[PDB]
Amino acid sequence: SMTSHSWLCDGRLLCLHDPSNKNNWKIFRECWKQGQPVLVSGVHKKLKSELWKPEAFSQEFGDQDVDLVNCRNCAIISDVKVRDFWDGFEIICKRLRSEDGQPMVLKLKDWPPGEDFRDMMPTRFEDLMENLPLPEYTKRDGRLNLASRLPSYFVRPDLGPKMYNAYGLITAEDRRVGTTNLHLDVSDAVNVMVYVGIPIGEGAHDEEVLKTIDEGDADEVTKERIHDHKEKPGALWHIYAAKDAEKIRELLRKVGEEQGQENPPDHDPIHDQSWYLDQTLRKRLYEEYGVQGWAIVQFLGDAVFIPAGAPHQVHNLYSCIKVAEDFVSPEHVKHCFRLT
Ligand SMILES: Oc1ccc(CN2CCc3ccccc3C2)cc1
Ligand SMILES: [Cl-]
Ligand SMILES: [Cl-]
Ligand SMILES: [Cl-]
Ligand SMILES: [Cl-]
Ligand SMILES: [Mn+2]
Structure with a gap:
C-alpha cells in the first residue's frame, strides 16, 4: 500500500x-x-x-x-x-x-x-x-523561511540554487576519499538528486558499490531499496548533530597531531574542509567520544534536508547531478546569529 x-x-x-x-x-x-x-x-x-x-x-x-x-x-x-x-x-x-x-x-x-x-x-x-x-520552508518567499526577513546581525544565504556535479568513486582505495569533505553550513539546506549516471566501458562495477554502502554503516531498509525496488543509488552521506561538532573537532585535532600536522591548539578542522571520516575514523569517533551519526544513501529523486550547524560529508557511488537551495527555518535561526 501507498503510505505517508x-x-x-x-x-x-x-x-x-x-x-x-x-x-x-x-x-x-x-x-x-x-x-x-x-x-x-x-x-x-x-x-x-x-x-x-x-x-x-x-x-x-x-x-x-x-x-x-x-x-x-x-x-x-x-x-x-x-x-x-x-x-x-x-x-x-x-x-x-x-x-x-x-x-x-x-x-x-x-x-x-x-x-x-x-x-x-x-x-x-x-x-x-x-x-x-x-515549500513554506524552502521557497524564497515561504512563510517559514526567514532568509529575506533578517537584519545584518544574521548571516543570510546567497541566492541559489547551486549545482553539484561529480563522477562516482570506483576503487577500494576510493572508499577512504570524499566527493565533498566534512564541513558545516550556518543556513539550513535541501539537496535534490536530479540525475544518477551509471557508466559504461568499465560497466560491471556493482559489487564495490555494495561493499561501500555496507562499510558506510547503511541500514537494512536502505539495502531493500536496491535489491527489492531496483532504485539507483547516487551518494553516501554521513551527517552529525550540531551539538556534536566540538567533539568532532577534538578527534580531528588529535588525529592531525598523530599524523605530524602542526596546527595551533584552537584551529578549526571542520571549517578547513580537509577531512573525510572513513570507516576507521567513524569507529574511533563512536568508541573514544561517544558520537554516532546518520548514514544516508541518497537515491535518484531523494531530497536530503540538512539542519544548520550539522557537520556533513558526501561520497558519490555513481556520477551525480545534485541541486541544493539554502533556507533559514525559525527552528535553527540561532546557528546564523553574529553574537554570543
Ligand atoms: O506519491 C505518493 C506517495 C504516497 C502516497 C500516499 N499518501 C497517503 C496519504 C498521505 C497523507 C499525508 C501525507 C502523505 C500521504 C501520502 C500518495 C502518493
Ligand atoms: Cl510546508
Ligand atoms: Cl534553462
Ligand atoms: Cl570538499
Ligand atoms: Cl539546533
Ligand atoms: Mn555545503
Whole structure:
C-alpha cells in the first residue's frame, strides 16, 4: 500500500513518501525541531527529466571555461571547457587521464558560478523551485523561511540554487576519499538528486558499490531499496548533530597531531574542509567520544534536508547531478546569529 512515511537509520530518520502532500509539515516539524536531518523521496517524478541530462548540459553550455578537482589527490585542473567534464560523465573512455594513465574521478567546481544559476538556466530554475518539498520552508518567499526577513546581525544565504556535479568513486582505495569533505553550513539546506549516471566501458562495477554502502554503516531498509525496488543509488552521506561538532573537532585535532600536522591548539578542522571520516575514523569517533551519526544513501529523486550547524560529508557511488537551495527555518535561526 501507498503510505505517508517510513523510518530509516533504524527509526532515527524520517522518510516522507509524497513530495507535494500539503500535510507533510505535520510529520516534518517535530523531527526537524530536534535537529535531525529528513529524507523526502520521489522528487524526480515531479521534474521534466529531459532538462536534467548530462548530454543537454554539454550541448547547451559546453564552451564555458571552468576548473575541475581530481577527487583522489585534490589537484586542481585549471581553465578547461565544461564539455571536457560532461562528455566523460558516463563514458569512462572519454575521461581526462592522470599521469598513471587511469581515467580521473573529477568534480566540476562552482558551476554555474556564484549566484548565476537563475540567469544561465531559467527553465531549470522554474522546474526545480516549483517542485521543492516543504515549500513554506524552502521557497524564497515561504512563510517559514526567514532568509529575506533578517537584519545584518544574521548571516543570510546567497541566492541559489547551486549545482553539484561529480563522477562516482570506483576503487577500494576510493572508499577512504570524499566527493565533498566534512564541513558545516550556518543556513539550513535541501539537496535534490536530479540525475544518477551509471557508466559504461568499465560497466560491471556493482559489487564495490555494495561493499561501500555496507562499510558506510547503511541500514537494512536502505539495502531493500536496491535489491527489492531496483532504485539507483547516487551518494553516501554521513551527517552529525550540531551539538556534536566540538567533539568532532577534538578527534580531528588529535588525529592531525598523530599524523605530524602542526596546527595551533584552537584551529578549526571542520571549517578547513580537509577531512573525510572513513570507516576507521567513524569507529574511533563512536568508541573514544561517544558520537554516532546518520548514514544516508541518497537515491535518484531523494531530497536530503540538512539542519544548520550539522557537520556533513558526501561520497558519490555513481556520477551525480545534485541541486541544493539554502533556507533559514525559525527552528535553527540561532546557528546564523553574529553574537554570543
Ligand atoms: O506519491 C505518493 C506517495 C504516497 C502516497 C500516499 N499518501 C497517503 C496519504 C498521505 C497523507 C499525508 C501525507 C502523505 C500521504 C501520502 C500518495 C502518493
Ligand atoms: Cl539546533
Ligand atoms: Cl534553462
Ligand atoms: Cl510546508
Ligand atoms: Cl570538499
Ligand atoms: Mn555545503
